[PDB]
């Protein structure tokens, strides 16, 4: 079998997280940069690490992978976390409200609101899954 052990996997993850700048998609270039930026004491292990680095580069070129936290994808994700719509999704001109919640709001001293539209309650009390 060709299962990579924790050594090459973790080395590849660290190398990608720390020097994502230099690594590419080619095995030869990844091999050369891996030899440059790391002290890998064996050439077979260096080649294995470079091969898994190429595989993971292909992986991350197609989306985010959980083991690596490169700064560019983290910046993109954090930018997505600050997205705010032009108008709040809660700024509805009309909010559909059932008669019972309207009565609750009446008891809540909020009965004069005109945004609320009273909807017809469902005449079916069929809300439970059949047993069996």
């Amino acid at each position: 079998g060709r299962v990579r052990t924790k050594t090459v996997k973790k080395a590849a993850r660290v190398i990608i997280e720390k020097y994502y700048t230099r690594l590419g998609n080619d095995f030869h270039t990844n091999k050369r940069v891996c030899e440059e930026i790391a002290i890998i004491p064996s050439k077979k292990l260096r080649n294995k690490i470079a091969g898994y680095v190429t595989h993971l580069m292909k992986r991350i070129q197609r989306g985010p992978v959980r083991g690596i936290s490169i700064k560019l994808q983290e910046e993109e994700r954090e930018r997505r976390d600050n997205y705010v719509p032009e108008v709040s999704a809660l700024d509805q001109e009309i909010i559909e409200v059932d008669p019972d919640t309207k009565e609750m709001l009446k008891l809540l001293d909020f009965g004069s609101l005109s945004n609320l539209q009273v909807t017809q309650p469902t005449v079916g009390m069929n809300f439970k899954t059949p047993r069996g």
């Binding site: 050594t7 080395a11 660290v14 190398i15 720390k18 930026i37 790391a38 002290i39 890998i40 004491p41 064996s42 292990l45 690490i49």
Partner: peptide
């Protein structure tokens, strides 16, 4: 002089 052959080193920023 040589390290453990399963030990991979990275220079720290």
């Amino acid at each position: 002089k040589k390290p453990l052959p399963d030990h991979v080193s990275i220079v720290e920023p």
